[PDB]
Structure formats: C-alpha cells, structure tokens
Symmetry: D2
C-alpha cells in the first residue's frame, strides 16, 4: 500500500478522478462558447494557474518574510517579498510611503480585516448603499435583519446615489457624515458605472477625522494600467481583490500609507499608524497560514500588469464598454447615470416593462452570463429591475468594439424573447413565467436559435488558459 499510495499521489487528475476531470472539461467548453458579461469575472493566465496549482500549497508560513513561526520558509519568503515588491510597482507606489499585505484570502475578509485593525467593535462606518451599487463587505442591513456581518460587529450607515443623475450624492454624504460621525468611509463600488470623486471623499474624511478606505476591487486593473485616476492619490488604505479586472488569482491585497504623515497631520505621533495594525489584524488576528500558492500566482499576475500589452488590454476594456453603452442606448435601453466611465454598465429595464429576473433567465438559456441587479427606484430588493454587464472577460479573449456591438444586439434579442414569454404567460408570477419558458415550443425554438448565434460568435475567439486542440468537448 506504501508504493501504491505514492502512485495515487503522483497520478494525473484524468486517471485519479475522471468525474472531476469531466466537470472541468465541461466548464472549459462553457467559457469557450459563452458571452461572459459578469463585470467581476475575467480569464486568468495559464502562468498564474500553474503557480496556484504548484507545491507552494504545501507550506505553513505564519508571520511575515524573515519573521516566521515555522522553519523551511527560505523560498516562500522569496515569493512573498517578490509579490509585495511587484504589488507596489504595479500601482507606481513609493515603498517609503506605501506598504502592502498580500495574505488576505479574498476581498470580503480583506475589508473586515481593515475594520478590525483600525476600528473598535461597534465603531461607525459609512459606505455606498448595497441597492445603489455598494458591496456587502461594506455593511448592509434591512428593516429586520443584519445581512452582512460587518453590520453586526460595526455600526454602518449607507450613503446614496442622486436618483435623478445616477451619480453619488456627495452633498448628502457630507451632511450625513456630520451627524453620524463615521470613523471610516469606504470609497468603492460593485455596480457603479462612473469614476469616484476621491478628492471629495478625502475632504469629508479630513473634516470627520475618518479613515479613507478605497475599495478598488472592480477597477484595480484599470488603475494599475493608468487608464483611470488612481485612488492612491487620496486614500489612507486601499483594498482590492486580485481576480477581477486585475486578472490574477482569487485573492486580495491591502495597501496602506506608512512613514511620515503630512506636515499638517503630524502630532503626538509623526508616523502613520496603519501598517502594524493591519498586518496584525491579518495575522495573528483573523487568519492563520498564508496561501502561498495563491501569493505566488499573484506575483505572476502583478508582473503581467506592468506590460504594454496589459495597458493596451485595459484601454480596450474602456473603449469596448463605451461602445457597448452607446449601442445599448441606441437600441432604447436606459442606463443608470446614462452611460459609463469604466468597465461596466447597469441597464435599467423599467422603460421596457420587464424585470431583471425574467431577462436573466433568458440570458442564461442563450449562454449569456450576466446578473440581475437592483437599480435606483426599485421598490424591493427581492425584485431587481436591472441587468449588470461589463467588458473585462470578453475583452481578454480579444473582443473589440464591433464585437460588443454584436453582444448588445444579442442581449436585445434575448430581452425581446423575455417580453414574449411574459406576454404568453397566464399569471403575473415568476413561476408562471418559468412555466411558459419551459413549455412553449415556439419560444424554446427562438431561445435555441439565439443560443446557437451566441455560441457561434464566441467560439471564433481564442480560449484563455488552455488550448482548443486538447479540449474534450469540441462541439
């Protein structure tokens, strides 16, 4: 059994677990044949995946480079030090003014670790309201329930959009902050199509003596390439995931000011007080052993973020989204804020007489991956009135402006099918919509035809991270 279990440890996935191998092959074909429009998704490189799938996973390395609680970490230290160096370089940060923690396991715990580092329990946080494009890891509660645990352990209050313009209502943010006295204000969003006024957030944070946390998860790759303004110009702390526009592994980073404070902010302490608190909140506070396979893959992704090819990619992401929005507007769709400055759009389906749940069900059946999304003016969060879509993932496969014009066309055809399913539905209920969607033979034929059109279009483009020639599912 000794030599036998060594064979099982060194055999390939195809031989050891054909069921799992088949699932991955099906997912490869899904990524090949679909319109992947979820703006938080991307296709990471083969080189990142080879690092994440390496023996770096075997090592325990609690602590920080050169200051570990375990032996054997000479090369894990090289990886984490290299990752930190490349993280600062990717955002053109002076290492005497900025530090970074690369151990946070994902975006949601990264933010919680910042709160734990800098705030006592029940201290006050302001952030963009979830139904107005915020994120759960900034806090969220309903009339009856705290949904995010951020709102359990800390005291949260939202700020909102101007529902007439679709931009953040900074005037109301400032006035609210005077009364609520936040200790930390979050500048970051999941479904905001415009650029943040980081200068205004900084002004409010200075008046309130609040920490300015920029959560740039969605835009980090755009920031790294220098194609939009950087939150590092203003923020005290910057969190980000590594798997969205950055195009890296699933993970996160926390950046923070260090060294001497501004002349007019030096007092009983002259140095920033973020580095030790954040590093200690990550470990020993809330995490144990770093995931060194992810950290090593992150180092790879951060080197890729420096290249001219990467800047060209992020430029194309923005130009594709601009064209995408223009085509949607010309086909009659309403966009929240009327357009976009970044990688995503938010379609408000109110002017079409159908909701996001119904449209997304059709999108899924025609191999278009998006998400239903609350829009300003929605009466209920349970019934989202919009669809969120973006350009990072298909841009990575080589979609350019005319290709996203085609994506908008096929989105439009899917909405028209959803409207027919609604018209053919007997009752008002979503259950009746689904029953029509699964029983009507003519409308199933139209969805089947649209699905073939999407797949034929998407299949022409390169696959990212694997070769077409060795795919199990080539049809």
């Amino acid at each position: 059994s000794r030599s036998s279990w060594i064979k099982q440890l060194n055999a390939s996935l195809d031989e050891i677990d054909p069921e799992v191998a088949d699932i991955i092959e099906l997912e490869k074909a899904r990524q090949w044949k679909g319109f992947e429009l979820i703006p938080s998704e991307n296709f990471t490189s083969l080189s990142v995946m080879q690092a994440v799938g390496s023996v770096m996973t075997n090592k325990y390395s609690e602590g920080y480079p050169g200051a570990r609680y375990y032996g054997g970490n000479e090369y894990i230290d090289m990886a984490e030090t290299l990752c930190q160096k490349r993280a600062l370089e990717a955002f053109q940060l002076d290492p005497s003014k900025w530090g970074v923690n690369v151990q946070s396991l994902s975006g949601s715990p990264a933010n919680f670790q910042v709160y734990t580092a800098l705030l006592k329990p029940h201290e006050r946080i302001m952030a963009l309201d979830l139904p107005h494009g915020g994120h759960l890891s900034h806090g969220y509660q309903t009339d009856t329930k705290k949904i995010s645990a951020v709102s359990i352990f800390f005291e949260t209050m939202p700020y909102r959009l101007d529902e007439n313009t679709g931009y953040i209502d900074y005037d109301q943010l400032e006035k609210s902050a005077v009364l609520f006295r936040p200790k930390l204000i979050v500048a970051g969003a999941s479904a905001y199509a415009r650029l943040y006024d980081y200068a205004r957030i900084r002004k409010v944070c200075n008046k309130q003596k609040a920490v300015m946390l920029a959560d740039m998860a969605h835009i980090s790759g755009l920031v790294a390439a220098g194609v939009i303004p950087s939150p590092f110009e203003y923020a005290d702390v910057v969190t980000t995931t590594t798997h969205k526009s950055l195009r890296g592994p699933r993970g996160a980073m926390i950046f923070f000011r260090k060294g001497l404070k501004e002349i007019n902010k030096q007092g009983k302490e002259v140095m920033y007080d973020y580095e030790d608190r954040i590093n200690q909140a990550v470990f020993p506070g809330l995490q144990g052993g770093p995931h060194n396979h992810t950290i090593t893959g992150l180092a790879v992704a951060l080197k890729q973020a420096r290249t001219p090819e990467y800047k060209a990619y992020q430029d194309q992401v923005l130009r594709n989204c601009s064209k995408f929005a223009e085509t949607l507007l010309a086909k009659g769709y309403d966009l929240v804020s009327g357009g976009t400055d970044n990688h995503l759009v938010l379609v408000n389906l109110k002017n079409k007489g159908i909701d996001g749940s119904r449209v997304e069900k059709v999108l899924e059946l025609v191999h278009i991956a998006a998400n239903k999304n609350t829009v300003p003016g929605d009466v209920s969060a349970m019934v989202p009135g919009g669809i969120r879509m973006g350009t990072p993932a298909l841009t990575s496969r080589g979609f350019i402006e005319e290709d996203f014009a085609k994506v908008a066309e096929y989105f439009d055809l899917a909405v028209k099918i959803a409207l027919k399913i609604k018209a053919e539905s007997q009752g008002t209920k979503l259950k009746d919509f689904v029953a029509t969607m699964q029983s009507n033979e003519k409308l199933q034929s139209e969805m089947s035809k649209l699905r073939e059109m999407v797949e034929e279009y998407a299949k022409q483009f390169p696959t990212i991270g694997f070769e077409k020639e060795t795919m199990r599912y080539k049809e």
Copy 2:
C-alpha cells in the same frame, strides 16, 4: 495588441515569469531534500493541484448550488454538490443528520464564521489555552492585548492542562464552565498529543446548554480513515482545515447537525438550528465568491480519503509517531504528556537547558523544518521552551518506523550542536547565539555535516506531486 496579450495569457510560467518558476523549483528541491516535520504540513497529490490550478478559478458563484446570484454556474454547481457529497461520505455521515459547508476559505475564518452564526457579539467561548496547545482562532489575549480577533468580538476564557500529566484537566474545565457559563466550548487543538475525551466535553456542553464545536483540523485525516475515534459521535458542529492530515488543498469545511434533535415535553419535534445560521454566516455574512478551484480540488482529496491506501497511510502516521516519541524519550527528551496518541509530539527542552528558539535555528540550518513552540511551564510566550514535530508529511513520502527513529537521532544531533553554540556564546542574548552560530567555523562545519546527513536520508524517498527527473535543481 490583441494577439500580443493573448499569447501572454496562454504562455507557460517558465516563459512568462522565470523568476517565479525558479522559486517554485527551489521549493520543489527543498521538499525533496529536507525533513518536513511541521505536523500541520502535508504533501498533497498532483490531481488536487491540477484541479486547484484549473479554470474553475474564473467563476463567480455567490450563493449555494441551485441558488446562485449569477448565471453560468451549471458546472460549478456540479463541483460544489459533488464536494459536499464526498465530504459527508469521507466521515461516514448520514446526510439526514449532518450537513456541510465547503466554502470557508481556511481554518481560522471557518471558526469565526461558526461563532458569528451561533453567538451574538461578546458572548462566551471556552477553549484550550494557546500556551497549552490551543489555536489562535479559539481566542487568546494577554493582560494588555487581545491577540486573536476572536477575543475582540467574543468573550473568551481558556481551559488548561493538568501541568503534572500534560492531559486536559477535564474536572477543572467542568468547574470553570459552571462559573463562566460558556455558550460554546471548543474541543480541538494544534499541539495536543493525546485524544480528546469528546464524551466528557459533551456532558459539560449538555449541562451548560453550550454548543459543542470540535475543531478537528489536525486529526481530520486520521478521523476520515477511522484510525482514531470520531468527534462526529458527540459534537454539534465540526470544523476542519483540508490541508493537514486530510492531505487536500488549503481550505476548510464546516459540518453541523441537522434535522430532528429531540421531542419536547408537549410532544412537538425540536429541530437543530445550525444549518441556515452557519450557511448564512459564510455567505452573505462574511465571504463573497466561493473559490471554486479550491472546492474542486477538495472534492478530489475527499475521494482519495476513501481508499484502503489512504487508511494504510493514516495507520502508518500513527505508528511512525509512536516510534518517534519512543526514540526521543530514549534519547533523554521530555514530551508534553509523556508521549503521543496521534500524529505529533511536543518536546519540552527544559531538562536540556536550552530554549526552542535556539534549537529551531539549528534545525533550520540542517534542513529540518519544525517550529519553536510554547510548553507548559514557560514563563514567557516570547521565549518558547519547546519544539513541535510530527509525522504526516514524511509519512506521505514513505517514511516508516525505523526512518522516524533516524529522524529522532538527527534531531538529537542538532540539539547537541545548539548546546555547543550556546556554550561558545560569550553573551546570553539570542543575537549572541546567532552571532556565534554564523561565525564559529568548527560549529558551521558540524552543521554542514548534519545537513548533508539529513539531505542524503530524505532524498532517497519519493517526491510527492512532481517527478524527480524534471527537477531543475537536482544538486
């Protein structure tokens, strides 16, 4: 532009990032050449790593199978459902009595998610004291500082070993619980060498109406193979990491009772109330998108845990540690609790007149990877008096009992060198010990000789997860 960055996305790690490729090859050689004795470390299979390094990383799948927020999750749902099914099967659990969450990113957040699910902020937790072999994610504070964030957000109090026997003092645990009124008691440890009396903990939890949480991270593979008694016989909730004795990817699982608990005095069924609370604490409470590459690799590892070869491995892990302990004792070392019933030992160096920091520095230089560790009787956590070592990792490479007798010999030779360095150190500070260790030619030669002995012994064994023939650093 297009074809340029698409080639970057599909190129190998060797092509794209030679510096990172070099670091991984160095780490491969280190895992080949050394005694990897950290008891929380293992060598996972190639098939696990191929799944972790797959395109499953690209998908956002917030929610649970068949109840996602995004579209496109048909195959991610297969993987997570398969992982859940295999998790219950690996521990012989009745799915009508047990459920499982496989999304928790690692062991430390998994425990925090259980606390957040079942306890209000500042409610009370008892667990094994960190200096007596507990874990930071069960709580820990000094008289001046909360070290673990568990002790910030919840109210923790330790239970302790009988310092005469090295076993948990269950009588004092019970008496303390009467006074402290815990809402949850943790049964699990990082450096405890004996089996838990889960039945006794169950009786205390019943008396206190406290949740019984077994944290089986270290022993989960032993439990899965059935070679030690199972905490599932008694516990309400069981947490575990997946990368230690289980031999899987870096990740975690939370198991919990579900279904009928009891009939009340009025004949009405009373159901367990763990499942919804725990699942909602993981998401949307504390995490965002699941790491589907890790969940997929975990499904692979859980299938591997079912084989007769895996059971033979875990039986060898136990026999190896017994022989290891026996040989250390014969060579004059003291072990906490005087021996072992599991996969690890904790050496208390007090009778040798040297601390764990000094010994671990020599171990590191002779390529024995272990950790300095606090022991009962240490006056300061800054000066650990022990060394923790265990058998899972080298047993995975085929070490058997006589091989761990040799590991004990080489550990002893390293301690003898550390004692010589201490004797030659003119000063008493650790930096004086380091200065002697780095400048004394005779003792550098002794360490070089022992390092060569360790490497010659370790290199003869198979490498796990890669082949020797293609190693870049064979010399």
Copy 3:
C-alpha cells in the same frame, strides 16, 4: 450609654447640628429674597416635604406592592399603590391602556432604565442635540469624548433645530431617521421654548418601527393641568421628573402603554410589551430598595396636581411667560424661536454684544438666579451666548403678569451693568471682567442698588414651604 444615643436620635436639627441648621436658614432667606428664574426649579409644598422627611425612609421594600422580597410592607404598599393610581389620574390616563413605575430615583436614571428595558447595548437612539436644547440623559458626545454614558452604552445621533426659525427641523429628523434606523426616538427638551410636534414624531416612529419616548420633565405640570397638549396621546413611553413644573419631590416616573396595541394580518391581537421589561429594568435591573419617603411625598404632589387651583397655577405660568417674553422683545432682546409657548424663554444675547457668562455673573450678584445657556450658532459650549429663564418658581409665590414685566425690567438693568463692566474691563478675558466687577466701586454700587431693588420686590411675596415669621434671617 443606651440613653446616650437615644437622645441623639430624637433631638432636633437645631440641637444636633447648628451648622447645618444655619445653612438651611441661609437658603430659606435666599429663596425669599431672590428672583428664582431657573425654569427647572420650583418651590414644593410643606406637605410634600413633611412626607419626604418621614419615617417612611426606614423600610426596605425591594420589589413591588404585593410582591415584595420582605415582610412588613403593608403600609409601604398602601403608599406606593396610592402613588401609582394618583399618577395615572394626574394625567387622565386609562389604567387599562397605561401603567406607571414610581420608583425611579430621578430623571436621568429613569431614561437610562427605559433604554435598558427596551434596547440591547449599542442599539440606536435619536434625540434633540444638547446644544439645541436637549438633555444629557438622551445622549451626547463631542468630537473627542462621550459625555453622557447613554452614548457609551447606546449608539446615539442628534436631531437639530432649523437655525433660521429656532423650531425643531422635523423634515431633517425624518430624513436622518431613514438612514440611521433608530430603535427609539426621544421627544423631550430642557431648553426648548415651543411645543413638540408629537404627531410628527409618532409618524416617524411608525415608519421606523421605533419606540416613541416622550421626556416631559420640564412640562409635566402643564400637561397634568391640561393647559398644553399631552404627549400621552402619541407616545409609547413617557418619562418625567417630579420636581420641576409638576412641583413635587425630587424623583421620577415612567409611564408605558399596556394592553392591546393592534390587530395583526392573521386577525390576532398584538399586545404591548413594555410593562414587564420596564419594571424589571428598574428593579432588579438597576435599582435596589425604593425610596419610600420620596414615593409618599410624590403621592401628595400628585393629589395636588388634580385640583382646580393647581390648574389655575399652571395657566398663570403660561401667561406669565408670555408676558415675560413680550417685555423682553419690547426691550430689544432676541429670543430663540422668537417667543415662547411654554414656561421658559431662551435669550440670545449676541445682538447686545455680550455673552451669557458675563451676564449671569451680574445676575448672581443682584440675586437673580438663572443659567447661562448655549444658543444655536454657538461654536463652543464653553462660551454660551444666552440666558435661560422661566416662570414656574416665582409663579408659585404669586408673581403675575405685571410682576414678570418687572422681572424683565430688572434683567435688562442687569444686562446694562454687565455691558458697563465689559466696557470698563482692562482686557477681553472673563478673568478681566471678574476683576473689574469686583474692584470697580461705581459698578459695585450699581449692582448693590439693583440687588436691593430685586430683594425689596421679592420679599413682598409669600414664602413657600416655611413661615416668614420664624425665619432666622429676616433682615
């Protein structure tokens, strides 16, 4: 020896403690010869004082009538039950819809006991901002310090005046409450000259599902007499002191809704859930033995509150304050909100070119007792711009409208002296003002003349609660 301490226990205050007896005689003369304008002060009756100074103080009576810890409480129960029933009658409350607790020791703990009964620690409270006329027992924090412990144990946020009108800005209160989600809103003030819009507060509390607490301490006697609108029409809970306009002993009452609240969606009766929680928060939650002497004096005060002459008194309080306000306005003073609808006025002195601290120092020296008071627009609570004055105390002595016209004249003469002291001061500091006020023979003579005028006017009126003829200090 036994005879020795019996004599000590039964001797008069004059025999036992001449120093304390003399202090009381000096205070009697001060209450006789001065203008007592502090609007939270009154002169309570001889009969109340005889009950408060009775042997009812000797009994320990933890618990509630008929449910005491100890025996011997048959007559204490007569008094407390009588007090409770008289309390409901004093405010014309239906005892099937309202209950009352009469044990709370004073106004500040009464509010804290309500919060403890109905809110978990760190739950949210809104109340009128302290510098805008609120009270510390509703919460208060500065930029750097929690001043009220209500703001330590609960999460507080103020609502504010419209600084253009001096009335509460109910529109902003409602908007703030949407974002802050208070669990309790306080409707009550210490330095607000207008009537509360209780119906508007009720509307906001209904929308927010918040408890409506009316703190009527200042206006309780006006409410009992039925000469201003009652908060009991709208509030869930009503707190009050017993020593202000109610004219009773120093103490407090907590009223709460009980019985049927409404019918739910299933047609089921929903009952109020305040009574048990509040009674248990008072005892055993936060207090021990009731002060039976105060409760007995309170019963006496509540019987007085039901009489026609008590209503005539409170009607006179209102007419006196209206005349007072009219006379101040005619003499060029600015009043916050432009006037009054209750028992007090708040004079904003800024248009006269002097502050409240300086004016109050002169008032004190001419035997006019008022308080310096923050006004809306003050930047520092350390430099108050206003003076607060009211009519309950002097109305009790028989001052009528023409007499308060005279009070306004003498106030104005004191302001003129303060302005002369400021003009003569050799410096701008309060310390320089005081030095001039104490050394300038001419201004000292003017203050002596005004003091004689105040005392000659006040001495004409009856003494309340003691006989003028037997006073020690009749000169």
Copy 4:
C-alpha cells in the same frame, strides 16, 4: 376676583400641613409609625433614622438645581448648597479618618445600586470583566447576577460578570478558588462586599489578588459602614482602591450613597515614572455628567447630619452594642440548638441554618411575619435550589437603635425559638408536603392561630416598652 382667589388658593395649598392637605397619606404614615413601634425588626439592612436627619431631608434644600460640583456649578444661586455639599464631603472623609490628600469622595450618588454602576462606568469599558460574591452566597444584585435563564442585574448586561463562592464546608469565602478563578477570567475589577455574610472580609487577600491581576479593588461596605466609622471592625480603606456604601443601613443616615476613591501616587513604575491614581475625575464625571443630573441636596444635607453623628462617642457606643448584641444573640441561638453558618459571627448579623431543625426558611419566615418578627429567608450551604432556602438571616442594628441590649436579644432569640416551634407544629399538622399546604394549615388551624396570636402579643408588648426613634409616642395617632 377669581384670578386672585385661585392664587390665594394655590399658595394656601403649598403652605398647609400634610395632616390638612392629605389626611389619607398622613394616616398611612401614622400606621407605619405604629408598625415600627411594635415589631422586632431583625432585617440587618434596616435601621431607624434620627429626627435631625429627617428634618434636613424634609427641608427646602430640595428646591435647588446644582449640577456640577461645589464652586463649579452650571446654575446660579448655589452659595449655600455649596456649603452643604462641601461640609458633607469634609465630614465624609472625617467619619472614616481619611487623609484628604489620599482620598476623595463623591456624595451625589442617589443610592447604593447606581453608585456601584457609576464606578463600573467610570473605570471599565462596556463588557469588561467584574468578579463579585455570588448573590446566593451573600452578594448583592448591583455586583451583577445571572441565572441559567437570564441576566437579572443590568450590571451583567453592560459588563461581563463572574461570581466567586463560599467554601460550603466552612461558610467563609473561598479565597483560594477566587484567586484561581481570577487567573483564568482576568477581571478588571473585583468587588469585596457582602449583604448576607456573618464574617468580615480578608481585604489583605483581596488586595493581593487585585495586585496580581492588575484589577481595581472595590470594597462595597454598605452593610458595615457604621461599624467601620466607629472603628469597631477593620476598615476596607486600609486596602481598597475605591469604596462604595449606602448612607442608610449600618451608617444610619438618609437613603443615599457615597463613593470614596484613592488620590495621589499609586507606584513608581519600572521606568521611574510616577503612576498616579486615575479615579477621581473618572468617577466624578461618571456621576455627573455621565449618569445623573441634579444632586438631591436635601439628601446631601441630611447625610452631612448623619456623618456628624457618626463621629460621636454615643455613636461608637451604639456600634459597640450592635456587635455585643449580635454575639449574645448568637450565644443564645447556639444554646438553644441552632446551627449558625460559619459557626458564629463577627458582625451585625447571623445566618441560621435550619436544617437540623427539620424545617426550611420559607416556613419559618411566614410564622415570624405573623408574630411581627421581621427576618428574611436565606440560602445556606447545602441547599439544592436558590429558590427554596434553608436558613434565616437576622441582625441587630435596628433594635439596638431603640435601646435593646444583650439581655433583650437573649429574649429575641427566645421568641424566635418559640416561633420555630410553632412552625414545626404547623408542618406536623399540615395535610400534605408542599408549601401551600403549610400556608393552608397556618391560616386554618384555630389552635395554632391562637398560639401565634399569643406570641405576637408577647413580641409587641416587649417592643412597645422601648423608645420610638424619630418621633414622640405622645403624639402618635395609634397608641394601641
């Protein structure tokens, strides 16, 4: 006409006597006066206040608002209120022989329970840890208390409490277990104070534990403060950081409280820096503006009177008699076959463990009440439930104030014993085993009712002979 008629009417209302204005309340007070005349008042927390204190508490000092502290007020008109509070503080320090450079005092706290809560609020953050004597072992609710069911005291809601307990073999506090518990629990504050404990505290031992844990030592001396002031037992001020007390109970003052706290140098630390005590500002600010508003100046003035009395030789003689009476009481109970918790007493009370008499405290307390002997049932070591107590608590302060001496408390023990004999007869005649069957017999058995009537007459006849405290017998409305 009517306006002036009304004004004259409400002024007449304010100046009329209680007898004229509210005869119903006056009658209640007269009934309570007669009750205090006729009973054996053995509840050890009760006492009889002096006339001079009551005259100050019932004075026009009640009319004044004086938020803040002497010389630092937020209202005008406080020249004489300042004299009273300053005098009260001075006499408070003098009553316990305290150096004002080492001790400060706050005299504004409204009663014993909020006084402790104010100390916790001053010195502890929310949810920080407190240890105190368990309530059924002799503690007090204001130190925290929770059952398996729920948190009873709000101290246990806002702070994290854990009890320490008696050695149930000896009846003394188990100081060894307290120390071991503190190592694990890490209290920030330990309370040394009891309400139903017949022994004095080992303040030296508490001090050692507090020093080792870097915890505040709070002595809550409510039950013993008058003994401390008279110098007849050791003082908590020798050891404690902060001392709270009721001003009623042992001290025999008005209903109120005091908070004492160390001032000045705590230690010179390892770096050579003076560490000063940080209690005065935190406690004073917790009382106001933190948790209270206007001081109750009538109570503060009555307290100054009580504190002057506490320094006299008559008061010292009284507190000496309190202790000697309790010892004689204990002597007589032991001679009559009763067991005392801890085997005796060192203070003003005893805890009778009724186990060897075959009857519990609930039954005995009911008979005592019917014969006008005021005592209270009390948990004793060995009880299975805190709800069915096996003992009775009795003490000497109140009757000693009326002039009971040693031979009189021998008689009190005799009449207590006669009541126990009646309770045992009721239990023997009870058709059933539950407490309601006992009450059914107690209310129905004509012969046993007659014995209780006889014993009640004996109790009242004995008590009536002694002086009344705080009022004259001659002017009582109820002279029978």
